[PDB]
Amino acid sequence: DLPMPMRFRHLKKTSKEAVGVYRSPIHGRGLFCKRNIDAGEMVIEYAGIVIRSILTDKREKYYDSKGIGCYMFRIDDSEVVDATMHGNAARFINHSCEPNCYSRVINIDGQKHIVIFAMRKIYRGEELTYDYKFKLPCNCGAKKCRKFL
Ligand SMILES: Nc1ncnc2c1ncn2[C@@H]1O[C@H](CN(CC[C@H](N)C(=O)O)CC2CN(CCC(c3ccccc3)c3ccccc3)C2)[C@@H](O)[C@H]1O
Ligand SMILES: [Zn+2]
């Protein structure tokens, strides 16, 4: 309804009251909603630093050697968002084969942002999930589960 830049300009405050991080039955911790989220709604930005894809291997190797969890979102074959040090709650979003959210790379005022949108109405208590771009067995539990990430 509202143009994309107008919708993006409001998020930090609204995501603080709309979502929370708790233990997930899918894997480790996940992002869950604290209030009902309308279909199409901008939920949260996957916050972090945009880096070149070639740099990920050494960055992940650095984090792993320090026993620090590595949180990255692959934009595509050339860019990645590193949420390890400068991330927010969106870094805990788990994968699902019947997701209720989807990721989009939006470019507002010359700057790229990965934003998460609701695919359907999401009800309080539900875990927020998106289909990861990509091996590892899937634990989403959906009827139509692809069984791998
Ligand atoms: N549908 C799914 N089915 C099966 N597995 C799934 C599904 N969706 C997501 N995952 C898993 O989550 C990963 C994505 N993840 C999403 C958030 C994650 N739930 C979390 O809690 O961090 C962010 C990455 C996980 N890492 C941190 C790990 C953390 C840890 C390890 C084991 C147990 C608990 C926690 C760790 C912490 C400190 C130091 C070292 C490691 C970043 C996928 O790569 C996959 O492994
Ligand atoms: Zn699945």
CATH number at residue 92: 2.170.270.10
Number of structural domains found in the chain: 1
- Quote the CA–CA distance of 46 and 61 in Å, as a whole number: 22
Q: Measured in Å, how far apart are the chain's first and last C-alpha atoms? A: 33
Does 139 map to a domain?
no
To test ligand 1's pocket by mutation, which of 22, 26, 27, 68 has the most ligand atoms within 8 angstroms of CB? 27
Residue type, 66: K
To test ligand 1's pocket by mutation, which of 29, 94, 116, 131 has the most ligand atoms within 8 angstroms of CB? 94
Q: What single-letter DSSP state applies at residue 78?
A: S
C-beta 130 within 6 A of ligand 1:
no
Q: What single-letter DSSP state applies at residue 10?
A: S
Domain range for 30: 4-130
Does 101 map to a domain?
yes
Q: What stretches of the chain show up as alpha helix (H) in DSSP?
A: 4-8, 12-18, 56-65
Integer CA distances (angstroms), 120 to 3, 41, 71, in order: 19, 9, 26
> What kind of experiment solved this structure?
X-ray
Residue type, 95: H
Resolution as reported, in Å: 2.0
Integer CA distances (angstroms), 23 to 32, 58, 62, 99, 105, in order: 9, 29, 26, 18, 27
**What are the φ and ψ backbone dihedral angles of 138, each rounded to 5 degrees?**
-85, 135
Does 145 map to a domain?
no
- Quote the CA–CA distance of 88 and 34 in Å, as a whole number: 16
